Design a protein around this motif. Sequence first.
Motif, short mmCIF file in Angstrom:
data_model
loop_
_atom_site.label_atom_id
_atom_site.label_comp_id
_atom_site.label_asym_id
_atom_site.label_seq_id
_atom_site.Cartn_x
_atom_site.Cartn_y
_atom_site.Cartn_z
N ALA A 53 5.00 11.85 4.19
CA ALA A 53 6.45 11.62 4.39
C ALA A 53 7.07 11.18 3.07
CB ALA A 53 6.69 10.58 5.47
N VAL A 54 6.38 10.30 2.34
CA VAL A 54 6.86 9.71 1.06
C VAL A 54 7.05 10.86 0.05
CG1 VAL A 54 6.19 8.15 -0.87
CG2 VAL A 54 5.91 7.41 1.49
N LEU A 55 6.10 11.80 0.05
CA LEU A 55 6.08 12.98 -0.85
C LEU A 55 7.07 14.03 -0.34
CD1 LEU A 55 2.20 13.27 -1.26
CD2 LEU A 55 3.83 12.77 -3.11
N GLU A 56 7.30 14.11 0.97
CA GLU A 56 8.31 15.03 1.55
C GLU A 56 9.69 14.49 1.19
OE1 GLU A 56 8.40 17.99 2.31
OE2 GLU A 56 9.96 18.36 3.84
N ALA A 57 9.85 13.17 1.27
CA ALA A 57 11.08 12.43 0.91
C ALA A 57 11.37 12.60 -0.58
CB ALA A 57 10.92 10.97 1.26
N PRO A 111 6.48 4.97 5.54
CA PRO A 111 7.15 4.68 6.81
C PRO A 111 6.58 3.50 7.62
CG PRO A 111 7.09 7.02 6.48
CD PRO A 111 6.27 6.41 5.36
N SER A 112 5.25 3.33 7.65
CA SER A 112 4.56 2.26 8.44
C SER A 112 4.85 0.88 7.83
CB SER A 112 3.08 2.50 8.56
OG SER A 112 2.38 2.21 7.36
N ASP A 113 5.16 0.85 6.52
CA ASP A 113 5.57 -0.39 5.83
C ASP A 113 6.83 -0.89 6.53
OD1 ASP A 113 3.33 -0.37 4.05
OD2 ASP A 113 4.46 0.83 2.56
#
Length: 212
Positions: free
Chosen positions: A33-37, A170-172
Amino acid sequence: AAPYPLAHPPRLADYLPPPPAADSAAAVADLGAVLEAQRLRTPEQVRRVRAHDHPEDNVFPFAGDLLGASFDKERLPLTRSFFNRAQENLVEVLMPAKKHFARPRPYEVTPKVKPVLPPPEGESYPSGHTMRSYFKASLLSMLVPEHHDAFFARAEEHAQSRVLAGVHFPSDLEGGQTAAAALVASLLADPAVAADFAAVREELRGALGLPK
């Protein structure tokens, strides 16, 4: 500004799951997600999120557009103070939890991640920002139930800005969210704090001309 002298503050560790494990189909989703973001974040989006905090009275720039220009840092001495003191009460339960969980940051998991915010060294869980945001929304939303839905969408904007920026998974955020809860409950349970928060309902509603 000084913390409210809480007899028993909550140990966030008790209220939170540990982050996803290194392999944990969870971990790959989180990192994915972080890399998609990163793939999708626009240049105007980057320069926005590098606006600059300066906490000082971070509750006002948090709302201030969601409330009136009645929401005056200058005209709200009780409100202003509360939020500044409780913020400190938060710092005191965040920093230990952060350290206990010592989670690697996204960029400390792969340098394919390029954080655009200045990138701290680990303690990636939970998310202090997310926590400060949902924390404020919570307390505001109690004081001004009218704009509940508004404040919480504000806290989301904020929270998410971090996954975009690359400094959190996201889980952070899921952690910051849960923790904010625990702290609020724990804080207003103290009747000295509960007293002050009543005076702040009158100040802020009276300042905004709201009834009840």
